Symmetry: C3
Subunit: 623 residues, 3 copies
RNA sequence: CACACAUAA
């Protein structure tokens, strides 16, 4: 039992009472909200040849724990909010696992109680840190996580539900010891860069206090870590031999600026196939995976050495240059709004669809509360079809990455969406080609599509991903020097150290998501990445403004229309039919939605003026 | 970009702008409707020893399709119309793939825009042809697809949505080069055979124009096909040796008319086990699959040679003889209607269930209720349980095949269903035993069940499947001679060249679905298949009419009943309850549903008079 | 066809007409309800090292005329009733399979018709027995199953739906030849032990009549069982050599009373690693699974020998001792009710949530997946998270064991739930740690949480599980000696012979579920298990009463509140919104539930007083 | 094993 004071908020951490059979278990309570988190790791190595870590955050109720929904999990599955929360917890603990820890691991979160005041998602991140800290699972230092909000110009740590509604910033910071930053995830209301940067410093300060509390509990409990059967890092003998065999060939490939995505990847594969045959005869007793991983380490090292020593990327540009950006709007006559945004070899097609305000509810109390209701009747749906990477995969359903990128792009465009719009706004982003930050291209393409559709957004929104390449001391672990890369390619993200996706208007920041592969980075690097990304965002907005600078004066002539019809009381029964049979038959035959306003007035929403025309023919003949 | 003119309609083909990473990609636009189709094929042979081809046609948003609430709902969120369209595209392009192309392939269709006038399903089939033609995937010859309708006596190519609603025919034709036919799929309003056959001729001519346009685009673009690392076909020398080993034994099995489905397959399995061991020792270095495929080649060739040379089939029938047909009706008292149709070793149990109109096509969620309503309040649900073939399988959710067979059987019975029926008609067909065309037996059995249930259908509907066995010289690819088989068995479909399922009444055709396994067949063969099936259809209808010839004079006395109950305004609040809680509870414990049709009256629908008794005692005590 | 008379009930059994392709099929008809059950077993040995047996019972509401309810107009998912019935059929037929029969097997039940009078779930169990008896699948003697009710103090065999609603007992008995019992599954309205016991012997008497009828049908129609490729059982000489290696080490582990669950499992596993390595050297050609199973045979035999010979268990308890029981209530402030029940190393956390009355009608009509309404507004959700056993597994649904345990614990507490409670009672039971009967700990912890929350339950409910260890004749198979164990651990259930989960009040029995692994046990053993569990139940209730003995005088202050708000007619449109949009929006972001009672009256339900405060502000500004 | 998780995203 350890209590951590974070300003006026109190955090209580305990262990050893519930779920004693798990490898690690902890209960983190703030106020009257208690969350129990368990960690289980198998002692038998898994054949997956990577780290199989899965985080499952579950809630027993929706709408601030007021509508019980846990009994519906067998068919109503997992909500979208739970998946996003699991992604945040996953990103806070994944980088800290030791390299080569190829053992199945699962972290589960149970909401013992929710008071509707303190948000349990932050307590879940801390609970996952305490459970792994107190367990015998090999894990690096404890992680503290807080949420920073801004209310009336004041920075509030772990704001309540009431305070978060009046906040202009929703930033979650995960911190490692020595004030390192592990995970960042924010959605701001177009706040200034200086205000945003100060809140990160405040957040990292609080996470240090939590780490101090968790360390004390670890010392009192007396935790001893297991000895894994084998850490699957390749031996230094194999790596140093692979360097002598493929350094100069990989160096030539990565300094060739005529390569595009597929040709560069093919060229690397050609070296991999030739080298791996020579590696097998050199070490016949070596594990087949160790041959695979030894080449990956060498290729990654050669890729980073060029950036560090020559300040030039694999495609020839410098650390601050953007890829070629092309924009286009109004491609199809029938779409309410459309845009095609291309960034290098990343292609994203965005579509804006207007619908009735009544489409934001599912007509069922439980299901509507599960997915919630959007504040501005605005949502974004992000798709990553398998042909974007010339691959074959299942097309039904959205994986975790698609959910995360959709919420990131939606948060970026949210602050500029106007209120009291007559229609529900749906933005659909499809990644036709992918070589980089397609999620940020969904904010740029979504902004162009919204302006093309006639939605009077306050300002355009652009995004950009910032990569990182560091050279750290092998023993001390300190970062000797680093390079910040603007608008990274896929290979630069794969071989890089972070994926700093940040979007906003030309005078503020609206969304941010940092995906750090390192076990924490200094706050100075994060500070410089935000400033560097703002320069890139200025250039991108210049290109977009040439294509379209202001929303069109009105919606498309063939767009949705809302009209009001009058039915007499005598004719009411015939028009509606037996139990609303006629209204739903008309809805299912022409797509028009009819709602009852008052005892004589019916609201009619039609997707097209033609659909209204034929629907009105039904109304006239039935009356 | 290439524009193909099909009468008064225009087809626009494009490539090289969107999704350049895919192996092939194309955008087909008609009017203001555009569909982009991509094809991806791996360079590594798949572990499975067949061609894995997946076609996924996805509607981006009907009205505003939005997104399913969660992952599991997404995995079930594919609509029935999307699945049927994907099957049509799959059958149009699968026969043109080379033999032995055991590589994973996926074709994905994305609806860029829909104007509500030009139907995108036909454009998707063409887009899949252009995408595969411009890709490096080896695909034999482009195909073209058009939809032919009959509006007030005129054959219309690619009719609009308004024209399709007044059409008496909904026929989709996919054609290969040289006027071949790859796919056929029709849904007619009981039209004459001569009118139906002419529409096929008109459609094939139009698809040749599309193929000409695609061929020009291929030549102008400069497509180069990949070289697969291995085409998995048995070597000619190992097939020849297998022929000498098992020609006589297989010939004896296929000439033995005392075999049924299980016995014949068991006998062939016995020869396969004996032959495979001998093959392995002769060719130790042969691929283990190559041993299996060599026997399948030999068994298929022996099976087809018997019918080509002797005009006799494995069960002793000639080319136009039907299997034994027996029918029953009214087997269970509580069923609204029932029928047990048996054809050969295929048994189908059909049930008819009536339900209220309000709870007949209408669900609670209007957003998802679209693509879920029926024109005549009529639908058919088809089930293929795993015990029909003595196999073990999952029973969770219908697969694509069950959805396709149910739609085909529903289209066959749709034109005879009366309009303005008091109740929603639902026909359930279960395949208890499967050895042949179970989908067609669902039309015949469904017709009997509808007649037994008391539904005044205009005429009885019967269906049949027609097979094909051809002899083609590999040096030319032409078809020298062929045999058309009536009411094929399972082995005749497996070793045959087509599955020509056509259904209709005694004076017209109501549905058709040709599943051609050859890379195109001439129009003459299709012309004779329809005529030959006409003879078989009338023979089946003779047997069916013996069991029952007209619908029963009235519905069963223990069927659903509807009447109104008057509720005063003062009693309305107590009767309905807070938020309709009392009615919702009543509809749960008992099957009765209460729908308000007037400010003072309520329409009560009870599935059975016995359940109606339970409802009446509830509403009497509520009234007090 | 064979007819069996059960008092006033008639049971018609037939075969040879439908689904003739399956290995075994049968149709069982009582009254107008007929059920067809088919059994299919593969011939190739399964890759899995156990018995793969799946039983699927499908409602198929087309038989009742009430299948078409949702927008897909077909059933989606499997209901709770379907899953529970499948488990009962599985428990009745699983023990009779021969040991080592590792062949894939599936049993499928199809409801041809239901009259709404005779329950088809009992006929499904009999049909599963006839289908297997007539098949060639190796299966032991036929099983007869009946349902016994008590109406007006009279025992009724196979009661109808009308009688089942006025019955104080719902007991299902499956019997083997020689009056053995293979399955017991009951739920009673707190009936006396003697009345409960007399129904069991009445039920077994009726099952013998059914078995006699099935035997006659099997005699009439020739049944020849297949010869499996091999029965996967360890060699007698390999088992004997394993016994010599690990007799003493295993005996030492099981006589060490200081072991807990994990340490005991690890100590046994250490001997397994040492012995299995030595076994391979002695028998190089033996199957790798044969080595694994031979050790499990020796370990099981040593474990049971200690109990039989010395009357002491692996943790030092005698045959009638309970583990340490610790209770605790009022765990958290915001929960309406909560309790933490611990028994030995099994820890269960129970929660009570009061919901609106309108949220308990989740059924087919409104929801595409849910079906039915609980009689009393009361349900129990049971969860078994993977960390309860230090394991990693999927956490989504599709778990039948959780459904079975939840239903057992729910009907254990159902008789004591008060009638006409203003709110829906939902009890959530989570197994934080498991080393035994977590399903019965859910009943003990459920009553503590219900009393803590303020629900005026009639009396407390406790549960316990009784194991069994028998020494049977190697040839005859008759039971020569047996020991009944109270509150078995996980190892005692795994190595035992039955899992007799029986719960109830201090003066009666409310639930029972016997999981017998033997091919039938004498009724005398069942009788003594009930008596033994009665003694344990009183001891458990004594401990529970010390923590809390009576329900709290009132619900918690932060519990739900229901109050009515009057709106004028002129403001009805503004408050409700277009098509009820405002009500659906307020209730989605606040958690309240508004139901229109009268023209001007709206009943607002708020889960917490704070929620009502937020809602009241929302209504107040709307009224402005 | 598969599934889910992570993965040139």
């Amino acid at each position: 039992a350890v209590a951590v004071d974070l300003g006026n908020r109190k955090l209580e951490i305990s262990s050893g009472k519930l779920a004693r059979f798990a490898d690690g278990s902890a209960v983190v309570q703030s106020g009257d909200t208690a969350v129990m988190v368990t960690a289980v790791s198998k002692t038998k190595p898994s054949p997956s040849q990577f780290m199989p870590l899965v985080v499952d955050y579950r809630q027993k109720a929706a709408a601030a724990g007021r509508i019980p929904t846990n009994y519906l999990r067998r068919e109503i599955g997992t909500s979208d909010k739970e998946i996003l929360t699991s992604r945040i917890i996953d990103r806070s603990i994944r980088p800290l696992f030791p390299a080569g820890y190829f053992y199945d691991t699962q972290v589960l979160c149970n909401l013992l109680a929710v008071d509707g005041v303190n948000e349990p998602d932050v307590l879940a991140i801390n609970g996952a840190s305490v459970a792994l800290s107190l367990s015998d699972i090999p894990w690096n230092g404890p992680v503290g996580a807080v949420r920073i909000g801004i209310i009336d110009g004041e920075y509030v740590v772990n704001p309540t539900r009431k305070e978060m509604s009046s906040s202009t910033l929703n930033l979650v910071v995960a911190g490692a010891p020595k004030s390192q930053i592990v995970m960042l995830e924010a959605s701001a209301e177009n706040i200034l860069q200086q205000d945003f940067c100060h809140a990160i410093k405040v957040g990292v300060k609080y996470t240090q206090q939590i780490i101090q509390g968790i360390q004390q509990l670890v010392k009192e409990t007396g935790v001893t870590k297991r000895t894994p059967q084998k850490l699957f890092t390749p031996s230094p003998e194999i790596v140093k031999y692979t360097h002598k065999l493929a350094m100069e060939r990989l160096y030539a490939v990565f300094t060739d600026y005529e390569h595009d995505k597929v040709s560069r990847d093919e060229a690397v594969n050609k070296i991999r196939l030739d080298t791996e045959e020579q590696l097998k005869e050199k070490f016949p007793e070596a594990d087949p995976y160790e041959i695979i991983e030894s080449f990956n380490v060498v290729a990654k090292e050669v890729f980073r050495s060029i950036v560090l020593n020559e300040y030039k990327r694999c495609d020839g540009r410098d650390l601050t240059s953007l890829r070629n950006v092309s924009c286009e709007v109004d491609m199809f006559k029938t779409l309410h709004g459309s845009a095609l945004f291309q960034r290098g070899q990343t292609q994203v097609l965005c579509t804006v669809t207007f619908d009735s305000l009544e489409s934001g509810i599912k007509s069922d109390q439980v299901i509507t509360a599960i997915n919630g209701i959007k504040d501005k009747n605005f949502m974004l749906h992000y798709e990553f079809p398998p042909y974007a990477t010339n691959e074959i995969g299942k097309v039904t359903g959205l994986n975790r990455r698609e959910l995360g990128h959709g919420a990131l792009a939606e948060k970026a465009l949210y602050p500029v969406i106007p209120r009291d719009f007559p229609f529900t706004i749906r933005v659909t982003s499809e990644v036709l080609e992918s070589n980089g930050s397609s999620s940020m291209a969904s904010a740029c393409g979504g902004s162009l599509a919204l302006m093309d559709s006639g939605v009077p957004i306050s300002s355009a929104v652009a995004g950009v991903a910032i990569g990182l390449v560091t050279k750290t001391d092998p023993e001390k672990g300190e970062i000797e020097d680093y390079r910040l890369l603007t608008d990274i390619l896929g290979i630069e993200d794969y071989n890089g150290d972070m994926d700093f996706k940040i979007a906003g208007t030309n005078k503020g920041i609206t969304a941010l998501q940092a995906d750090i592969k390192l076990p924490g980075i200094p706050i100075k690097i994060v500070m410089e990445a935000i400033q560097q990304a703002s320069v890139a965002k200025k250039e991108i907005l210049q290109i977009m403004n040439k294509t379209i600078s202001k929303p069109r004066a009105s919606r498309k002539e063939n767009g949705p229309v809302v009209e009001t019809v009058q039915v007499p009381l005598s004719k009411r029964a015939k028009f509606v039919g037996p139990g609303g049979y006629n209204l739903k038959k008309l809805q299912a035959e022409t797509g028009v939605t009819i709602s009852q306003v008052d005892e004589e007035t019916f609201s009619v929403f039609a997707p097209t003026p033609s659909a209204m025309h034929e629907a009105r023919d039904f109304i006239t003949e039935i009356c």
